[PDB]
Amino acid sequence: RFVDDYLPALLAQASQLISSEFHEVARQHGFSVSEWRVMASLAGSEPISIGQLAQVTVTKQPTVTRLLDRMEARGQVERLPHESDRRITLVRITRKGLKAVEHLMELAREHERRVLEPFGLRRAEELKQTLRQMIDLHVH
Amino acid sequence: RFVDDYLPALLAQASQLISSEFHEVARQHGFSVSEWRVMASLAGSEPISIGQLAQVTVTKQPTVTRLLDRMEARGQVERLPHESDRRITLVRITRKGLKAVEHLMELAREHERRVLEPFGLRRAEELKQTLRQMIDLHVH
Ligand SMILES: Nc1c(Cl)c(Cl)nc(C(=O)O)c1Cl
Numbered sequence: 001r002f003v004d005d006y007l008p009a010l011l012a013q014a015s016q017l018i019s020s021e022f023h024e025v026a027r028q029h030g031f032s033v034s035e036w037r038v039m040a041s042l043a044g045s046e047p048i049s050i051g052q053l054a055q056v057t058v059t060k061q062p063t064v065t066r067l068l069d070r071m072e073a074r075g076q077v078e079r080l081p082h083e084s085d086r087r088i089t090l091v092r093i094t095r096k097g098l099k100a101v102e103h104l105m106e107l108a109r110e111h112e113r114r115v116l117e118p119f120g121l122r123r124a125e126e127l128k129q130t131l132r133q134m135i136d137l138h139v140h
Numbered sequence: 141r142f143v144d145d146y147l148p149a150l151l152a153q154a155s156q157l158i159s160s161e162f163h164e165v166a167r168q169h170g171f172s173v174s175e176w177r178v179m180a181s182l183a184g185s186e187p188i189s190i191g192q193l194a195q196v197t198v199t200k201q202p203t204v205t206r207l208l209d210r211m212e213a214r215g216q217v218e219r220l221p222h223e224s225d226r227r228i229t230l231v232r233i234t235r236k237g238l239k240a241v242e243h244l245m246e247l248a249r250e251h252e253r254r255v256l257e258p259f260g261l262r263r264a265e266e267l268k269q270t271l272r273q274m275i276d277l278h279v280h
């Protein structure tokens with residue numbers, strides 16, 4: 001059966017199943033999926049472009065811009081001009097956003113550890129390395 | 141940076157990037173993403189339940205049911221009663237659907253081979269095995 005070992009189907013199912021487990025925790029802590037993705041992606045990061053944020057959060061850019069309108073209104077993120085290009089807007093998490101998301105990030109790390117524990121450190125690191133290499137080869 | 145090596149973020153980005161490449165081919169051949177997922181998932185398969193189809197295609201069940209309404213109208217799939225449970229509807233691809241999707245499936249295999257070639261057979265098989273094991277541990 002083609003679909004049983006078709007890579008894009010395997011990636012999508014694993015991603016949906018693992019993510020859906022953590023989304024229940026995020027909601028119990030008052031976060032939407034998109035708010036969790038944005039704050040977790042900006043935590044501990046230097047300011048990044050809207051386009052970079054859209055790529056790492058797998059969210060369409062117009063959706064990200066609307067999300068940032070409301071997250072900035074709530075003081076959780078800040079948009080700022082690029083030091084050179086008028087075309088580029090950068091975005092950062094604020095202290096308020098970081099404090100709001102820190103505990104959830106620790107829960108996310110615990111959930112990830114539980115997901116990866118049956119595989120062992122070797123297989124877990126190999127998976128993460130392969131995924132990172134694939135992203136870096138296919139990102140635009 | 142948390143997000144740089146957070147497994148759910150890595151899975152989601154790799155899945156989105158790889159899938160988006162193939163979706164361009166599917167559309168050039170007249171398929172929507174959802175039609176491609178359904179027909180490819182049913183190709184060469186015995187009839188499966190709507191719930192199984194929704195899981196493997198990562199599509200919400202009500203969306204799948206509406207999709208099947210129109211795909212069945214076009215003669216590409218068929219819904220049939222479960223041999224035991226009135227609660228369960230099964231679904232299969234028809235010959236018309238299989239003939240419509242066969243060439244696209246060969247293109248999908250070629251694209252997958254190109255995605256996996258830089259990694260080598262060992263790393264490719266390890267990735268697929270880990271993803272399959274994760275799905276089977278997290279599916280409900
Ligand atoms: N791209 C993602 C990022 Cl950045 C984070 Cl933190 N979480 C998730 C998830 O929903 O599991 C995703 Cl897909």
Ligand SMILES: Nc1c(Cl)c(Cl)nc(C(=O)O)c1Cl
Nearest residue numbers: 008009012159177180196197
């Ligand atoms: N779940 C999926 C299945 Cl069954 C197929 Cl054939 N293709 C894709 C894709 O869009 O790349 C997905 Cl996610």
